[PDB]
């Protein structure tokens, strides 16, 4: 008879409840990812043709992520979904066209040495769900740290048209020291989730390519950032962002120093002093390797001193440029000038699986 689909759904009921609470981490581990495998193991959850108890999961965790200030609720889907993706990827042989008081038996988060699962159509179909929902809470994070720094960066942008005193500038320097705090604040929530390091080199890596983007089109399209003591402002913030890499670590960091590698040639050829002796060679291979012609062009010849009075490279320099950004129309060859951030999801679950 048919009581078998009321225990299920009692079963479901019962795992949705506990899931929607916070279970916390046991040693370094996420609790709700290793419940979830288990039951899902033991009522052999991956063998069944029709069930209900994946979508119930799915639904749990969208419910979960789609609130107001959800940054906490998402480190913890994002630590749980991980641990969960990487059990479900050293488990589920593909098939097909790809071709509750028994935990306490032991620890929750001490597994029986994974062993394969042919995972019924289902089962494939929720690795696939619980892959895209990975991703979303990923971006989320992300896009959530990008919408915090973006003001900030904002007003680090404004720092020429603010100082229309050593103590102004200093309070526009503390605009650098913001944006380090709110750093620190969701490396500190994902370290406190356990969030996998390699999950969060990503995240630090993205969000400085974005850094990279907003403080290096503003000297390329703002003629007011374009100038000497600009230079100087921006190295100072680069000074504070590169000592978080390091107080971060390359665990935490990863190449996200690297990502900076444009404003820093940039900024370094801002604030170069005696710019019209210097030879075309020079600027373009031992100051700006990264800069393209078009780039450096647009900063030679927008670049103004109202400080220090510094010309620019020299007006044979300016020439050598002009003529090769001609060369280049004229084979129709698209060159590098405004930057675009790094919006992509940069990982997939085999690299995931493949580090921890």
């Known amino acids: 008879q048919k009581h078998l ?75 749980n979904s991980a641990t969960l993706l990487l059990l479900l990827q ?30 019924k159509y289902p089962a494939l179909l929720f690795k696939q769900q619980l892959t895209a929902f990975l991703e979303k809470i990923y971006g989320m994070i992300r896009d959530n740290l990008k919408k915090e720094i973006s003001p900030l960066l904002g007003l680090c942008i404004q720092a020429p048209r603010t100082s229309r005193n050593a103590v102004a500038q200093q309070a526009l320097i503390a605009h650098w020291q913001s944006i380090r705090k ?76 690297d990502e900076l590698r444009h404003i820093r040639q940039a900024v370094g050829f801002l604030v170069i002093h005696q710019k019209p002796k210097k030879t075309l060679d020079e600027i373009t291979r031992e100051l700006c390797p990264v800069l393209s012609i078009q780039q450096l062009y647009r900063i030679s010849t927008m670049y103004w001193d109202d400080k220090y009075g510094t010309h620019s490279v020299s007006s044979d320099v300016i020439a050598n440029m002009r003529v090769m950004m001609t060369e280049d129309s004229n084979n129709a060859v698209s060159s590098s000038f405004l930057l675009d951030d790094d919006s992509s999801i940069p ?5 995931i699986s493949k580090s921890m």
Not at 100 to 112: A, E, H, V, W, Y
Request: net charge negative.
């Open 5 to 79: 689909n009321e225990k299920q759904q009692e079963n479901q009921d019962l795992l949705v409840k506990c899931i929607s609470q916070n279970l916390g981490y046991n040693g370094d581990k996420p609790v709700a990812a290793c419940v979830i495998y288990k039951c899902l193991l033991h009522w052999r959850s991956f063998e069944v043709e029709r069930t209900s108890v994946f979508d119930r999961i799915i639904q749990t965790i969208a419910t979960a992520i789609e609130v107001p200030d959800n940054n906490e609720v998402l480190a913890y889907w994002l630590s």
């Open 182 to 257: 709110s750093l620190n604040s969701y490396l500190n929530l994902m370290k406190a989730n356990n969030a996998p390091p390699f999950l969060v080199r990503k995240v630090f890596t993205q969000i400085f390519s974005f850094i990279n983007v907003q403080l290096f089109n503003s000297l390329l399209l703002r003629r007011e950032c374009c100038s000497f003591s600009n230079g100087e402002y921006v190295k100072a913030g680069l000074a504070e962002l590169e000592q978080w890499c390091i107080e971060a670590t390359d665990e935490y960091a990863g190449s996200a120093w």
């Open 90 to 119: 050293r488990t589920l042989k593909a098939t097909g066209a790809a071709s509750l008081s028994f935990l306490n038996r032991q620890g929750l988060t001490k597994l029986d040495d994974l062993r394969q699962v042919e995972a």
């Open 347 to 351: 990982f997939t679950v085999e690299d």
